[PDB]
Ligand binder design. Structure first.
Ligand SMILES: C[As](C)(=O)[O-]
Ligand SMILES: [Cl-]
Ligand SMILES: [Cl-]
Ligand SMILES: [K+]
Ligand SMILES: [K+]
Ligand SMILES: [K+]
Ligand SMILES: [K+]
Ligand SMILES: [K+]
Ligand SMILES: [K+]
Ligand SMILES: [K+]
Ligand SMILES: [Mn+2]
Ligand SMILES: [Mn+2]
Ligand SMILES: [Mn+2]
Ligand SMILES: [Mn+2]
Ligand SMILES: [Mn+2]
Ligand SMILES: [Mn+2]
Ligand SMILES: [Mn+2]
Ligand SMILES: [Mn+2]
Ligand SMILES: [Mn+2]
Ligand SMILES: [Mn+2]
Ligand SMILES: [Mn+2]
Ligand SMILES: [Mn+2]
Ligand SMILES: [Mn+2]
Ligand SMILES: [Mn+2]
Ligand SMILES: [Mn+2]
Lengths: 108, 125, 95, 120, 107, 127, 107, 89
DNA sequence: ATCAATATCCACCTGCAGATTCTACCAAAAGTGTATTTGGAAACTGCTCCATCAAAAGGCATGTTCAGCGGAATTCCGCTGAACATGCCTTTTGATGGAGCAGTTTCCAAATACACTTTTGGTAGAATCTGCAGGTGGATATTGAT
DNA sequence: ATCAATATCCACCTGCAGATTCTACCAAAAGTGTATTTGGAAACTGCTCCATCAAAAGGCATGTTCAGCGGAATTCCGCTGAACATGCCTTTTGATGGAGCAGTTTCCAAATACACTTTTGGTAGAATCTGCAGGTGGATATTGAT
């Protein structure tokens, strides 16, 4: 008994929407261990990430077309980041992006 | 098939790309979002690693500032207002998001000086 | 257009003059948030007109995405895409 | 034994010789300045919700009949509209002040919209 | 003769495509006795390239919002309505369905 | 007919542009849509459609630019003509609102308030 | 006038009359108004802070000059509207500033 | 440190002369100009060129060239919301 | 009004910078016809969530009164820009080594495709937390009356 | 300068509606591993088209007015804020039918792919040719002084 809930259903479960949420949350606990976030502010963080994602990918896409290149590599992403972000935000993003690629490749 | 295995060992199984890159953000997802987004015929292996780093970084930058605005307002939970204050009070984030509106974010307290009351008196006011 | 059959349905009631629901106190409050201290009498009518144009343009695009999706329901995403193309990206509703 | 035994909405002495009450009145601009600090401090939408929704249904309807709306679609429109009007009023305010005025006028809104290329 | 001298310099300049000939043909239909300077032709090129990207770009986004994999004349059409001012749109829409119709009605 | 053709008379051909009745290059518009990374696929009608729109906008500017040339007693359209045609057409101007036409200058236009006062010259009505 | 200028001799156009003539002359034409070389020099100097030892295709400088002048002429138009708004006919820095704040080039 | 020599000094930005700025203003329909406008215009032009050139040079280095190209500028102008027709693209 | 001065327009002229037109080739498209694959309409349907209807009530809109003080008209003067007379110097025009942009061949490190496994994020719905909205309640600030 | 009057600040208090917390459970990513292809870095280099410079050329730096603009100062009128009475419609809570999103599975009209054939647009010269800039000259509108 109890193995089920009488269901007798006709599929149609969900669809599953992804979001950067658990990741926005991991990064938040790191800079502010005791701070939480409202689902509406998460809503906004989610929009930001999608937004910046498309700006960089887009700029990366154009850069490559302008150069008759058919592949987007870390190097295109890098100059997209320099074209898109201002002053200091760019310096640090570049350095952290470079750092992650180096560590990622020092790996098997 | 089933529970799985009495594994959870520690030595030679798979290693996520994020972990490999020292990131919290998802390298595999960024890579997938890149190939599906029709950005180029091809997406190199480093592309998503680098992009995930920049995205994680920027959200780190914004959360750091917003968390502080929350603290300045004696609150524990970041709400949209906090995100606004942190974005408008930071020149770079403000320029990066100059054409963005944060729902429920309001604006920054700011009154043009000529609008302030002139110390009583007559003359002008 | 589907919606409309008569009998069990209809008599939607005519919508008109709703631009007047943007009341003077509402426009005043908006001006205050905007840092405005003093408001001339003609501002209210001027503001309704500017709001109307802003909304026609955004609804016009949001509605075009709806029709293109073959939907009859305007979605938050329709409005969000409309906003993005009009240069007014909005965070908070599915961006 | 409570015969409205309140100390006083005032206090002490007895200079109640005369016949002058004269209710309190804020000077023009004081409540307005007060309202600016109040509204610049909060985030809630300022246009009433149902009327706004009707305005949206009327404009939409004029474009295409039989449309439905998710409620968040309407809320999206309002957050965008109010963020836009507040932004325009800030520019309008700078146009008035530029004019050595303190009162925003239609022409200040027009000037700000022309400069924004909404009129170019 | 036909110079078969490999010394006459076998350079080979990577060729650039442009819409010049087509812009010129169209000019000839609307104003048979009118010319156009090369500078003016550069502007019209810029123009065509720009409208092309604005429309493709919009069609692209349109298909993505709708989880579709292909760009059809339908997307090109919604893109046009989103992009052009009122009458320009009506006409461009009309021109467009017309060329597609003529096209299909002639296999 | 019923019993004809027996040798050589028919081949095969026809450019897509010709079939669509267009001057602009359908084939190329198609290649450009595929090379552009706009979508995984591109239906056959899209390049037709896109091509006609580009052609049509091109004739509209050319037509007006042509007139501006003729108005200046010029036979060859220059950038100034493209700018005069564009900026004087309400819609074209809107579409090209964030574009600058190299060597185009601007529409002659002086704010009323900057004109000299008193009166004006030339017998503006009399005998 | 004739005054005692170049050994007597009259004629002086009133303040403004030549300004208006200049406006008509310049809105009627298209050439660049900044001298080429100086412009070039400023451009190379600014570029030098971003990457040393660069060369410039002459057409790149030209596009930059074309783009810069169309920008300033346009900015001068908005600046002029801000002066007039304030009932002046003389553009001042606060007018350029106001136009830039409202254009969002801001700050 | 060279190329300008004696008799003349003046930084390059001062090469954008009062008369040329005045001409620009005239095309802009401006009738009267205050003295302080000239320096204000130079700083504005300077900001405009930095923003544009910076981006054009970023396109150059990415293409690994030593020569800023018209296309580099045109793509930069497009990024800055200043689309320019006539120089390629 | 009336002239003197000077800017402006228009009609005509003609050299040459920039079109334009004619071979000649050619490889890079563009078209054709021939499998093979597959997006994405239908069609059918469960299951959100959108539209409506009700009903109560107090937050807020409306319309009014009154008068402070801001906007705008006016006058007036001091100063700051416009106009102007030209020699002087920087820019313009037009050849000329040589830096690189741009062809072209090469060949691997790295991308793609695909078969298979293994790990994860999303979701569901029931708990069970908890910040903090919003309801006080006294400091202490600010404003407006003298 | 007080110093009534009212606004407002800042801490405290504590339910409850959002938030953080699971215990599945799964499909669906995401990571393995192994072939197969290939994008483009690297190297080499020819030939544009840059940077540099001498004469030529023609714009601008300068100093002296003085016209006329901007902005100070003064002055009222009447617009617009503050306050207040009144009462309505928006908000809130909540239930309910059913429109119409949004899964799912069934397919073929249309798209991808390839392979081979046919054509065209781009390039190089080459030799003309041609619109119109810029130069002349006379007339004539415009501006400014009298
Ligand atoms: C919405 As209507 C009444 O203007 O058609
Ligand atoms: Cl890579
Ligand atoms: Cl199609
Ligand atoms: K081929
Ligand atoms: K006053
Ligand atoms: K005043
Ligand atoms: K002076
Ligand atoms: K001066
Ligand atoms: K390898
Ligand atoms: K139901
Ligand atoms: Mn007279
Ligand atoms: Mn399928
Ligand atoms: Mn009432
Ligand atoms: Mn070399
Ligand atoms: Mn898990
Ligand atoms: Mn509270
Ligand atoms: Mn005092
Ligand atoms: Mn709850
Ligand atoms: Mn290869
Ligand atoms: Mn004045
Ligand atoms: Mn149904
Ligand atoms: Mn040919
Ligand atoms: Mn040739
Ligand atoms: Mn001429
Ligand atoms: Mn003459």
């Amino acid at each position: 008994v109890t193995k089920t809930q009488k269901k007798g259903d006709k599929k149609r479960k969900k669809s599953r929407k992804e979001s950067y949420s658990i990741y926005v949350y991991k990064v938040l606990k790191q800079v502010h261990p005791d701070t939480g976030i409202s689902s509406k502010a998460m809503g906004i963080m989610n929009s930001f990430v999608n937004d910046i994602f498309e700006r960089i990918a887009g700029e990366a896409s154009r850069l490559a077309h302008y150069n008759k290149r058919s592949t987007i590599t870390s190097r295109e992403i890098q100059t997209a980041v320099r074209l898109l972000l201002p002053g200091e935000l760019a310096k640090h993003a570049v350095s952290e992006g470079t750092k992650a690629v180096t560590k990622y490749t020092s790996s098997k | 098939s089933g529970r799985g295995k009495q594994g959870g060992k520690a030595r030679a199984k798979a290693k996520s790309r994020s972990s490999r890159a020292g990131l919290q953000f998802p390298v595999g997802r960024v890579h997938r979002l890149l190939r599906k987004g029709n950005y180029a015929e091809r997406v190199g292996a480093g592309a998503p690693v680098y992009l995930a780093a920049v995205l994680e970084y920027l959200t780190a930058e914004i959360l750091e500032l917003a968390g502080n605005a929350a603290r300045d307002n004696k609150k524990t939970r970041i709400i949209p207002r906090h995100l606004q204050l942190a974005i408008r009070n930071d020149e770079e984030l403000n320029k990066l998001l100059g054409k963005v509106t944060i729902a429920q974010g309001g604006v920054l307290p700011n009154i043009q000086a000529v609008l302030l009351p002139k110390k009583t008196d007559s003359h002008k006011a | 257009k589907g919606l409309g059959k008569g009998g069990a349905k209809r008599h939607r009631k005519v919508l008109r003059d709703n631009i007047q629901g943007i009341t003077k106190p509402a426009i005043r409050r908006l001006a205050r948030r905007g840092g405005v201290k003093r408001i001339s009498g003609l501002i209210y009518e001027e503001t309704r007109g500017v709001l109307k144009v802003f909304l026609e343009n955004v609804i016009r695009d949001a509605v075009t995405y709806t029709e293109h999706a073959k939907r009859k329901t305007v979605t938050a995403m329709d409005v969000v895409y409309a906003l993005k193309r009009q240069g007014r990206t909005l965070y908070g509703f599915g961006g | 034994p409570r015969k409205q035994l309140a100390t006083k909405a005032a206090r002490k002495s007895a200079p109640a010789t005369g016949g002058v009450k004269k209710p309190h009145r804020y000077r023009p601009g004081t409540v307005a300045l007060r309202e600016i600090r109040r509204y610049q401090k909060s985030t809630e939408l300022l246009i009433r919700k149902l009327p706004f929704q009707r305005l949206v249904r009327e404009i939409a309807q004029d474009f295409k009949t039989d449309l439905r709306f998710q409620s968040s679609a309407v809320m999206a429109l309002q957050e965008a509209s109010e963020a836009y009007l507040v932004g325009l009023f800030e520019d309008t305010n700078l146009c008035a002040i530029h004019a050595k005025r303190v009162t925003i006028m239609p022409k200040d809104i027009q000037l700000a919209r022309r400069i924004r290329g909404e009129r170019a």
